[PDB]
Amino acid sequence: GNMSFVKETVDKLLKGYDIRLRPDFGGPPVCVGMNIDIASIDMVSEVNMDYTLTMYFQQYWRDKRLAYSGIPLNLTLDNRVADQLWVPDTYFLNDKKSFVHGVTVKNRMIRLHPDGTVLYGLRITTTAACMMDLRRYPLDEQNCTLEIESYGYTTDDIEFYWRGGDKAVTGVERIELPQFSIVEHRLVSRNVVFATGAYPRLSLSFRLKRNIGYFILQTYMPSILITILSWVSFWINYDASAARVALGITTVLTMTTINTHLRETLPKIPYVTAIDMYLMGCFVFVFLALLEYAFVNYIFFSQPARAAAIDRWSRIVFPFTFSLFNLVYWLYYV
Amino acid sequence: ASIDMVSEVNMDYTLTMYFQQYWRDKRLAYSGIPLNLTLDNRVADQLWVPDTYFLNDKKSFVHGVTVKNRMIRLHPDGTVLYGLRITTTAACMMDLRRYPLDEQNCTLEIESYGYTTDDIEFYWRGGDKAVTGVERIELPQFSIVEHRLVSRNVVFATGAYPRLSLSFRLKRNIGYFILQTYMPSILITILSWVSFWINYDASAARVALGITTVLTMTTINTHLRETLPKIPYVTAIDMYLMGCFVFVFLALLEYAFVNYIFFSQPARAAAIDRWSRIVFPFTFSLFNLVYWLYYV
Amino acid sequence: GNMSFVKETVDKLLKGYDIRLRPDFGGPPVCVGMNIDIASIDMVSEVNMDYTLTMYFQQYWRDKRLAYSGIPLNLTLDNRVADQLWVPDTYFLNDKKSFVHGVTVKNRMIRLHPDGTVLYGLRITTTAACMMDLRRY
Amino acid sequence: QVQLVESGGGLVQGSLRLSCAASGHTFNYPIMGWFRQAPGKEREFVGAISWSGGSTSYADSVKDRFTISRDNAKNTVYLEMNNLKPEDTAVYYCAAKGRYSGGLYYPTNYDYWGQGTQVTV
Amino acid sequence: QVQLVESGGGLVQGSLRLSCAASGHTFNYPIMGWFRQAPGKEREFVGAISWSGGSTSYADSVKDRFTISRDNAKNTVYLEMNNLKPEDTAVYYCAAKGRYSGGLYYPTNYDYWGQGTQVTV
Amino acid sequence: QVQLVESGGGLVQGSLRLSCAASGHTFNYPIMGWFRQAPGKEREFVGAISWSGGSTSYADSVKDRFTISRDNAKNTVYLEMNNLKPEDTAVYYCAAKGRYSGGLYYPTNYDYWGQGTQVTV
Ligand SMILES: *[C@@H]1O[C@H](CO)[C@@H](O[C@@H]2O[C@H](CO)[C@@H](O[C@@H]3O[C@H](CO[C@H]4O[C@H](CO)[C@@H](O)[C@H](O)[C@@H]4O)[C@@H](O)[C@H](O[C@H]4O[C@H](CO)[C@@H](O)[C@H](O)[C@@H]4O)[C@@H]3O)[C@H](O)[C@H]2NC(C)=O)[C@H](O)[C@H]1NC(C)=O
Ligand SMILES: *[C@@H]1O[C@H](CO)[C@@H](O[C@@H]2O[C@H](CO)[C@@H](O[C@@H]3O[C@H](CO[C@H]4O[C@H](CO)[C@@H](O)[C@H](O)[C@@H]4O)[C@@H](O)[C@H](O[C@H]4O[C@H](CO)[C@@H](O)[C@H](O)[C@@H]4O)[C@@H]3O)[C@H](O)[C@H]2NC(C)=O)[C@H](O)[C@H]1NC(C)=O
Ligand SMILES: *[C@@H]1O[C@H](CO)[C@@H](O[C@@H]2O[C@H](CO)[C@@H](O)[C@H](O)[C@H]2NC(C)=O)[C@H](O)[C@H]1NC(C)=O
Ligand SMILES: *[C@@H]1O[C@H](CO)[C@@H](O[C@@H]2O[C@H](CO)[C@@H](O)[C@H](O)[C@H]2NC(C)=O)[C@H](O)[C@H]1NC(C)=O
Ligand SMILES: *[C@@H]1O[C@H](CO)[C@@H](O[C@@H]2O[C@H](CO)[C@@H](O)[C@H](O)[C@H]2NC(C)=O)[C@H](O)[C@H]1NC(C)=O
Ligand SMILES: CCCCCCCCCCCCCCCC
Ligand SMILES: CCCCCCCCCCCCCCCC
Ligand SMILES: *[C@@H]1O[C@H](CO)[C@@H](O)[C@H](O)[C@H]1NC(C)=O
Ligand SMILES: *[C@@H]1O[C@H](CO)[C@@H](O)[C@H](O)[C@H]1NC(C)=O
Ligand SMILES: CCCCCCCCCC
Ligand SMILES: CCCCCCCCCC
Ligand SMILES: CCCCCCCCCC
Ligand SMILES: CCCCCCCCCC
Ligand SMILES: CCCCCCCCCC
Ligand SMILES: CCCCCCCCCC
Ligand SMILES: CCCCCCCCCC
Ligand SMILES: CCCCCCCCCC
Ligand SMILES: CCCCCCCC
Ligand SMILES: CCCCCCCC
Ligand SMILES: NCCc1c[nH]cn1
Ligand SMILES: NCCc1c[nH]cn1
Ligand SMILES: [Cl-]
Ligand SMILES: [Cl-]
Ligand SMILES: [Cl-]
């Protein structure tokens, strides 16, 4: 209540305080407890193999230099006091670019407790690397992580833990990606060894299952409709050479434009994806429909009955063998 | 000041505003001066100010030319008026099931970062008149139907925090979409019917009309969904384009049926073309009536 | 263990320390040893003739002004002490745009050793020029 | 350069419809305001309408009594004065506001003023 | 503006399926929560489900006993109460949470509360 | 979740080919390492290979003697132990390292350890 008394108490905490020295310097490691409250996952990029996360990142530790008596309150202090305190050197090892939000002030909290416990909160947006396996794309499941580490302090000086264990991370239900569902999240803790020593690590991982619906509408259905269009040729008189070759050309070339367009939406991977396998199958069907007409055109003068029979056969065999192709494909990948 | 942009692809909007905070700090009370003191902006760095933030912002800044766009006005009783000019890109999750005949609700969520309701309380100063300049908003693609001001407390693991919400209802203007997508689709569908007046012996001509209209309707569909986020559901415009696709595909199958029978059954073939000339335009008119009644 | 003793030791190191002067100013050159731990090469661009590298960039040198006695430890100090020390003026001559990562703190380490050896680490992302010969592309 | 002509005032004891017809560069002046000046008193805000969108605002006194709207075809704005009172006795003026010309409520922000219809009840 | 109607409570000595049917603007309220209030005690979190994705969370007490899920077709959420106990004796309520309305666990964050089925065993 | 089975050890007086066959989520574990543990001494790095690219590294002791490589078809890595010595007498283990799991050289960074073939010469 007496603000001069609180000012005196806080001035005494910071008098002769050395920001250069971690709590218990030269003694047992300082234990830092971590909480995260997920605000959003804004974007997931196959092209850049990364995702953008916004979170409230909370660190808890004890600094006995900040212990205070005669005030039965937790002190919430203006954010700018963080610049006068030691704080952990925590970083995100797989981040590409991160920032702390800055409006209307730096999005930072400091809450002190009488025993010298510090609660330090930051609101962070991070773009973090997620290497993706696109062999089953777009029927794929990805594992995207956030790797949390001490930059310069080894496990002699600092230890990390998930504060609350498996409840340390909240807000996974807030994640609203149109193209993905979050199947599961996991929290891991370990030590990592480098040439400069052993460092504490925490890992948060997500399993992201791609939703098929966009791909049905954008690629699969158009490819199916072009393949069906190619079969119209088999009901057209074999003397209609311009009409049947036009159907053949337009379907073959449309199937090439769909293929080349698709791979411009993805990174330059050297392997075949599931959707590439579908488009390559559809290509073979529409190419064979044109070769069927070439065969009919070539023989119908000399052998008009054989030519007629091949068109009749094609009307059943193309739809049947495309149905078989689809059955095998969608069983293998779903 | 403005809403510069609304993005369906990024599900966000960009707002520029003058953000004013009023509070009393009795440490700043002064006597013997019957004036309100406007001080150079740089004094804000020597004062306590609230830790206010925008919970759904993606990226925000205070304008900085020619100085930080900030005001401090002191009053004799220790009342501080603190003003900032801010541009914020803020998240707005959109429901695109009725797009582009859709209405969206975009909010700005205002909260204390670190102070709980034990330390800080927020209110809309002037109540329902606390927000001005909604008439300035000039989005070509949207009209602002309504705005609302809400006040509540929000609970997290670290405690209860004061919240203010400003929300807008944004009604999409149809006109751009009539010109860009609906009219082209209608004109391709009408083009497909030209086939029914062409002699059935003109196989190259009638198959060309069929192919070109079917493939143009596919290019319109695929192009459209590249303007939008990768949602797994069907939008209203997708429903229109899928209907137009079925019409132009059936016009080509009509010729395939005529081509298949006109040698043996030239009278049946002639009758099917005659029927098609009335039934396609009639059933497309019905389709349009049902569609535009359901969505308007 | 005594934090007042370590504070006294570190205050004495920085008392009358001139950041303007390299170690052994006017004497033999300061030898700077370099390590790199590659984290990633994110992108290679034929259009921009460049690549993007993320690395842990380590510099080692001896500054006898920072030598300390009576502490059989290597001192890891809070990163902000780097602003009170001389450090090498190392740069990447073919970089187009580089930054030191800044969350949750500047991604920087300072470790002192009793003989005045400094280990200075930075986490850097650099876009660097790579002129490409595309005749066989 | 905007011209404003207003009509449909007159004398009554009742529902009334004042109208305000604009011509010229209305693009630069997206807002039309209705003010009223009683004998002796200062010029007073009634309401305002955006030409594009029809975004509307009212003074408390006329809130849930008067209604303003427009039609961009004729370049016309109208104040529909329903549920009239003997306090509603003033020279009613129409005016245009520039895009960056300040708050709606303040008559000095407005540039192009109509003649001003006298209304008594 | 959301309406919630819950059913499938009743009295038993066993597996049970409570259901919670939503109608209105459910897009603005992506989370449905199950709470329960014993006589005297405070209103208590049971679990919550996202409408979109089916992302689920449970209180420790009912973890590996109760299971929540939904169907977006009917706009319905269900609490499947298996392996019941005499501690599970309360007025069970359903509620909707706004997108930015705070932590899952706290009943004051929720806006649209069902009637509340009494369940005794 | 990775499983590693190694074979082609045995007893000799000469060229040898140890092999290491992986199965499961190898995408998350892009590096395979060879270690060896002599009786009494600590577990020691021999070499490592990336599954994708075949980027290779060796301890100095076996540099220009042993050669590691793999085939992604069989999901198999092999240590070709040529120019053997009586110092090369240890339990040879195979292991998998996660993408962000630290330096190649340190056996505590590795998660999925093979059985371990004993080799004496
Ligand atoms: C996404 O992908 C990542 C891989 O990149 C997966 O990460 C692995 O997750 C598993 C758990 O699912 C982790 O395994 C666990 O590791 C813990 C730490 O182990 C190390 O550190 C301790 C000391 O701190 C050492 O003792 C130990 O030897 C290791 O060096 C272990 O403590 C865990 O053990 C417990 O569980 C296992 C069963 O899983 C039991 O057998 C044990 O008895 C014990 O109860 C466990 O092994 C693994 O470390 C992670 N790998 C990496 C590289 O991070 C994610 O799981 C995946 N995410 C999703 C959502 O799928
Ligand atoms: C865009 O979409 C958002 C949803 O995301 C809508 O936001 C809701 O808006 C309504 C009003 O339209 C809000 O309802 C009001 O909430 C007030 C606060 O309630 C909480 O906090 C108080 C204490 O501070 C508690 O007492 C209370 O129990 C709540 O926990 C209420 O005070 C209001 O009550 C008054 O109005 C209602 C009728 O609406 C009366 O019944 C009451 O008697 C009283 O007079 C009211 O309930 C709701 O809180 C908002 N939700 C969220 C999540 O923010 C926007 O309205 C919408 N915008 C547009 C333009 O459409
Ligand atoms: C200061 O903060 C601590 C930690 O948040 C509070 O102690 C907790 O109190 C809650 C109940 O309010 C308990 O559920 C926790 O178990 C307590 N934790 C610890 C570590 O003690 C404490 O109440 C706060 N003090 C004041 C005066 O508000
Ligand atoms: C200092 O500022 C205050 C607040 O703006 C002024 O007080 C207001 O004066 C207007 C009329 O000018 C009234 O409509 C308000 O009701 C007043 N508000 C309050 C809180 O008193 C005050 O006039 C200013 N002082 C000077 C000397 O200009
Ligand atoms: C301080 O750091 C130095 C350098 O890292 C350590 O000395 C090294 O110790 C390792 C074994 O732990 C040896 O392999 C190196 O050859 C040593 N290098 C030098 C230059 O001496 C030293 O052990 C560290 N001191 C403490 C107390 O941990
Ligand atoms: C959830 C998985 C989605 C599975 C999609 C299946 C689509 C396959 C359609 C088959 C098309 C056959 C053409 C008709 C030939 C007679
Ligand atoms: C404000 C809502 C806009 C409604 C747009 C209606 C357009 C529908 C046009 C119908 C086209 C029919 C083609 C002619 C067939 C005889
Ligand atoms: C407030 O604190 C100051 C400094 O400790 C002290 O001098 C003063 O007596 C206190 N006043 C009251 C009213 O408690
Ligand atoms: C700690 O160091 C200070 C400063 O050198 C000294 O005055 C004090 O006696 C030391 N205390 C202990 C317990 O070593
Ligand atoms: C691969 C080149 C095209 C071949 C056409 C086949 C026509 C029928 C051959 C008798
Ligand atoms: C998709 C079209 C399949 C129709 C088969 C035609 C068979 C004709 C039998 C006389
Ligand atoms: C006749 C077409 C069959 C298409 C395959 C059905 C979907 C299988 C999903 C497992
Ligand atoms: C990786 C192999 C994929 C197999 C399914 C594709 C369809 C082929 C059917 C003949
Ligand atoms: C779906 C494949 C194309 C079928 C054409 C139908 C022509 C008329 C059938 C008698
Ligand atoms: C849009 C074209 C509709 C014209 C109908 C033709 C009817 C012909 C009747 C003999
Ligand atoms: C004859 C074409 C009918 C088109 C529908 C008219 C528009 C309806 C809007 C409700
Ligand atoms: C969501 C259902 C939309 C219904 C209107 C679309 C037109 C269909 C007419 C047959
Ligand atoms: C876009 C050209 C490739 C089409 C698939 C070929 C399959 C053999
Ligand atoms: C762009 C290809 C899809 C066309 C619509 C199909 C409706 C059945
Ligand atoms: N925190 C350890 C940083 C590191 C990685 N590589 C080398 N140093
Ligand atoms: N102002 C409360 C910030 C918050 C959100 N989540 C956790 N903490
Ligand atoms: Cl960064
Ligand atoms: Cl920001
Ligand atoms: Cl630079």
PDB file of N, CA and C and ligand atoms in Angstrom, chain A residues 231 235 312 315-316 319, ligand 11:
ATOM      1  N   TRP A 231     -12.959 -40.396 -73.017  1.00  0.00           N
ATOM      2  CA  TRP A 231     -13.739 -41.601 -73.410  1.00  0.00           C
ATOM      3  C   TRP A 231     -14.859 -41.228 -74.384  1.00  0.00           C
ATOM      4  N   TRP A 235     -17.411 -43.025 -78.579  1.00  0.00           N
ATOM      5  CA  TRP A 235     -18.825 -42.991 -79.055  1.00  0.00           C
ATOM      6  C   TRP A 235     -18.953 -42.148 -80.332  1.00  0.00           C
ATOM      7  N   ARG A 312     -16.047 -50.506 -79.571  1.00  0.00           N
ATOM      8  CA  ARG A 312     -17.068 -51.143 -78.700  1.00  0.00           C
ATOM      9  C   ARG A 312     -16.401 -51.628 -77.401  1.00  0.00           C
ATOM     10  N   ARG A 315     -15.205 -48.786 -74.967  1.00  0.00           N
ATOM     11  CA  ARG A 315     -16.304 -48.146 -74.218  1.00  0.00           C
ATOM     12  C   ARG A 315     -16.490 -48.819 -72.852  1.00  0.00           C
ATOM     13  N   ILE A 316     -16.149 -50.102 -72.724  1.00  0.00           N
ATOM     14  CA  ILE A 316     -16.308 -50.850 -71.436  1.00  0.00           C
ATOM     15  C   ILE A 316     -14.956 -50.916 -70.721  1.00  0.00           C
ATOM     16  N   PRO A 319     -13.387 -47.397 -68.864  1.00  0.00           N
ATOM     17  CA  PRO A 319     -14.027 -47.086 -67.587  1.00  0.00           C
ATOM     18  C   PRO A 319     -13.772 -48.143 -66.504  1.00  0.00           C
TER      19      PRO A 319
HETATM   20  C1  LIG G  11     -18.737 -44.569 -68.098  1.00  0.00           C
HETATM   21  C2  LIG G  11     -19.417 -45.154 -69.313  1.00  0.00           C
HETATM   22  C3  LIG G  11     -19.601 -46.652 -69.251  1.00  0.00           C
HETATM   23  C4  LIG G  11     -20.641 -47.194 -70.217  1.00  0.00           C
HETATM   24  C5  LIG G  11     -20.363 -48.590 -70.748  1.00  0.00           C
HETATM   25  C6  LIG G  11     -20.945 -48.852 -72.121  1.00  0.00           C
HETATM   26  C7  LIG G  11     -21.251 -50.301 -72.415  1.00  0.00           C
HETATM   27  C8  LIG G  11     -22.097 -50.512 -73.647  1.00  0.00           C
HETATM   28  C9  LIG G  11     -22.546 -51.938 -73.867  1.00  0.00           C
HETATM   29  C10 LIG G  11     -23.316 -52.154 -75.153  1.00  0.00           C
END
